């Protein structure tokens, strides 16, 4: 069901499809979001993903 929600968006608005599962998607900017918050500060998990 998660990928059906992703693909339904990309069909009408001709955009890229990600490899792994996103968590959110903004309809104004047309950008996917991938959450990954943790006990580390910022740079150790930002540049890894």
Partner 1 sequence: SGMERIKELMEMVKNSRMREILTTTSVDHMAVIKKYTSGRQEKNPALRMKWMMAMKYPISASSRIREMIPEKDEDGNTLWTNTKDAGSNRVLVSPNAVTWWNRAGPVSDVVHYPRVYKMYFDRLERLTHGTFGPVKFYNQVKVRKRVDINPGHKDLTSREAQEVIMEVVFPNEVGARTLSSDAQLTITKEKKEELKNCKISPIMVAYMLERELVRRTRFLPIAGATSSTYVEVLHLTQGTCWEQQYTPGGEAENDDLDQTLIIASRNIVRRSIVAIDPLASLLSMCHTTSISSEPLVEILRSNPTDEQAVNICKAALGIRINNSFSFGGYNFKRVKGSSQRTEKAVLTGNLQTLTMTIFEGYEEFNVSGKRASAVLKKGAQRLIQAIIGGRTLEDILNLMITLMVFSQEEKMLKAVRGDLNFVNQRLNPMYQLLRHFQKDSSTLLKNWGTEEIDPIMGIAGIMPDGTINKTQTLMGVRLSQIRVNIDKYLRVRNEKGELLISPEEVSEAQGQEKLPINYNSSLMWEVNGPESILTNTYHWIIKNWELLKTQWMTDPTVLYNRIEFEPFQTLIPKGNRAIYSGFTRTLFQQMRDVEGTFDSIQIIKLLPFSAHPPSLGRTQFSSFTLNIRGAPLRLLIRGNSQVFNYNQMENVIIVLGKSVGSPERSILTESSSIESAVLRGFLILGKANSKYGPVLTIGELDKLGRGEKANVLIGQGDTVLVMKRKRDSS
Partner 2 sequence: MDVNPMLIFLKVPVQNAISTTFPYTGDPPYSHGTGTGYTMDTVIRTHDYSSRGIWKTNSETGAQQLNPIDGPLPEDNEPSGYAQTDCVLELIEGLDRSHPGLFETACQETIDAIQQTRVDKLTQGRQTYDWTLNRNQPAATALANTIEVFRKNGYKLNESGRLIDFLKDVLLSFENDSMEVTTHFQKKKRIRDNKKMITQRTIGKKRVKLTKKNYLIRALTLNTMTKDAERGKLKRRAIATPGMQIRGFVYFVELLARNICERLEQSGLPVGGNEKKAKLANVIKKMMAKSTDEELSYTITGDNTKWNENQNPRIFLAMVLRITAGQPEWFRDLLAVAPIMFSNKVARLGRGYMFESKSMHLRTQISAENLSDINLRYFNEDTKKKIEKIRHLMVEGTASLSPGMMMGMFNMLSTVLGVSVLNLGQREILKRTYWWDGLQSSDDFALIINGHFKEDIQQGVNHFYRTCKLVGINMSQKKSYINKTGTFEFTSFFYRYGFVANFSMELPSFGVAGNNESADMSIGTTVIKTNMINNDLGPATAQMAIQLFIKDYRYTYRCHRGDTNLETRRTKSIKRLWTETISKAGLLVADGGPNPYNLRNLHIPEVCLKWSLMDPDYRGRLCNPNNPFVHHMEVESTNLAVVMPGPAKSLEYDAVATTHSWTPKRNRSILNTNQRGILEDERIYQKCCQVFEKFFPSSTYRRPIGMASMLDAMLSRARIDARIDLESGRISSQDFSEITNTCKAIEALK
List contacts with partner 1 (CB under 8 A).
Answer: 3-4, 7-8, 11, 17, 19, 21
User: To the nearest whole angstrom, how small is the minimum distance from the Cβ of residue 49 to partner 1?
Assistant: 18
Toward partner 2, which CB reaches closer, 13 or 38? 13
Q: 34: annotated binding-site residue?
A: yes
Alpha helices per DSSP H over 1-49: 2-12, 43-46
Residue 35: which of 17, 15, 13, 20 has the closest Cα? 20
Backbone dihedral angles phi then psi of residue 14, each to the nearest 5 degrees: -65, 90
Question: Does residue 16 belong to the site contacting partner 2 (CB under 8 A)?
Answer: no
């Amino acid at each position: 069901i998660a990928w059906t929600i992703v693909n339904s968006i990309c069909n009408m608005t001709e955009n890229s499809k990600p490899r792994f599962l996103p968590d959110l998607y903004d309809y104004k900017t047309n950008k996917f979001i991938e959450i990954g918050v943790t006990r580390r500060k910022v740079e150790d998990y930002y540049y890894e993903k």
